[PDB]
Amino acid sequence: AKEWGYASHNGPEHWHELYPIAKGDNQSPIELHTKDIRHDPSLQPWSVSYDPGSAKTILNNGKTCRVVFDDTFDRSMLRGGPLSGPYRLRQFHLHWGSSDDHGSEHTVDGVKYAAELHLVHWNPKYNTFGEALKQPDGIAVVGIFLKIGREKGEFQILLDALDKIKTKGKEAPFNHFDPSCLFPACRDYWTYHGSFTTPPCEECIVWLLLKEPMTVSSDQMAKLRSLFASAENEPPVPLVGNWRPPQPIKGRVVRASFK
Ligand SMILES: *SC[C@H](NC(=O)CC[C@H](N)C(=O)O)C(=O)NCC(=O)O
Ligand SMILES: *SC[C@H](NC(=O)CC[C@H](N)C(=O)O)C(=O)NCC(=O)O
Ligand SMILES: [Zn+2]
C-alpha cells in the first residue's frame, strides 16, 4: 500500500525507499538564506481571481486538513509572477508543529514559523492534474507562513469546520470560501523550482513563497492541533508535526521579487 508518515519508522528519512525521487536534486522544502537569494529585476507581480463558490469540501486524510476546490473549468485562477500562463486552484492544506515555536516547512534565515499554508494550482494546458504532475512546471504553489499574533477572523471559518472532520477519512461540505482573504497585504515573494513536500515528491512545482506572514492567535493554532491522524476505529494519535525537514538546495537559485 506504500503507506508513509512523519514518524521514525515511516518518515521523511525512509521515503526514498518508496519513491526514489525523494532523494532527487530538486526537492522541497529548503532553507532560505540571504546568502543565496538573487534579486530578479524581471520578476512581475502575480494576482488571483478566486470564486468563493468553487470551494467544495474539507477533509482529514490523516496527513493534513485539505480544502478541495472545483477545478473542472477555469473558475479560480492564479496568474502572473514567474508563470507562463494562468493556473487553476485545486486545493489548499496546512503543515504545523507540536507547539507554536515551529511548524513551517520552509525556513527563512534560520527561523521557522508556526505553520505553512500551501495553495496548490495546476496548469490547465496539460489537460488533467495527473498529466500536469509529469511536467517540470505543471504545478504552482503559493506558500504562506503563519505567525502568532492577533486572531484572524477569516481563518476561524476553517477552524469551525474541523469538528466535522476530527479523524482520518472524514469529509464534509465546505462552501463559499475565498482563500485570498487569508493573504497578507504585502505581495513580495521568493520563487524557485522544487517538489511536493509529500510522497510521491514529484519535482513539478514552481514555488511562490510570500515574504510577509499571516498572523493567527495561539488559540487558533491549538484548534488545528486538535485533529487526529488516526481513524475512528483506531487508538488516538494527534495530528501534529506534519512537516518535512529542509532538503539540500543543490544547484538552485532562489529569486526574490524585491531588492
Ligand atoms: S476577502 C479577500 C479579497 N476579496 C474581496 O475583498 C472580495 C472581492 C469579491 N469580488 C467579492 O465577492 O466582493 C481578495 O480578493 N484579496 C486578494 C487581493 O489580491 O487583494
Ligand atoms: S510589500 C508592502 C505592502 N505594500 C503593498 O502590498 C503595495 C500597496 C500598493 N499597491 C502600493 O503601494 O503599490 C504593505 O502594505 N505591507 C504592509 C505593512 O505596512 O507592513
Ligand atoms: Zn504542503
CB neighbourhood size of 41 (10 A): 7
Residues measured by CB to lie within 5 Å of ligand 3, the ion:
118
> Experimental technique used?
X-ray
- With b for 16 or more beta-carbon neighbours within 10 A and e for fewer, the 2-15 pattern comes to eebbbeeeeebeeb
Q: How many domains is the chain built from?
A: 1
114 with 147: CB under 8 angstroms? yes
Please give the C-alpha separations between residue 80 and each of 41, 149, 231, in angstroms, as whole numbers: 15, 30, 41
| Torsions phi, psi for 33 (to 5 deg) | -120, 130
Q: Which residues line ligand 2 (CB under 6 A)?
A: 185-188
Q: Following CA atoms 199, 205, 210, 211 in sequence, which dihedral angle do they give, to the nearest 10 degrees?
A: 80
Question: Where in the sequence is the domain holding 159, given as residue range(s)?
Answer: 1-259
CA distance 144 to 215: 10
Q: How far is the CA of 94 from the centre of ligand 3 (A)?
A: 6
Cell readout for 221 is 493554532
Hey, which of 183, 186, 210, 212 would you mutate to test ligand 1's pocket, going by the most ligand atoms within 8 Å of its Cβ? 183
Instruction: Tell me if 64 is assigned to a ligand binding site.
Output: no
Yes or no: say if 186 and 7 are a contact pair by the CB < 8 Å rule.
no
List pocket residues of ligand 1, CB cut-off 6 Å. Answer: 178, 180-181, 183
Residue among 186, 187, 214, 258 to mutate when testing ligand 2 (max atoms within 8 A of CB): 186
Identify the CATH number of the domain in which residue 259 sits. 3.10.200.10
End-to-end CA gap in the chain? 47
For ligand 2, atom 13, which residue shows the shortest CA distance? Answer: 186
Distance 243 CA to ligand 3 centre (A): 8
Let me know the angle formed at the C-alpha of 92 by 231 and 234, rounded to the nearest 5 degrees: 5
How far is Cα 45 from Cα 87, in angstroms, rounded to an integer?
A: 15
Distance (Å, rounded) from C-alpha 86 to C-alpha 48?
9
Query: What is the whole-number distance in angstroms between the Cα of residue 256 and the centre of ligand 1?
Result: 25
**Cα separations in angstroms, 143 against 117, 118, 120, 236, 256:** 6, 5, 9, 30, 14
Based on its alpha-carbon atoms, the radius of gyration of the chain, rounded to whole angstroms, reads 17
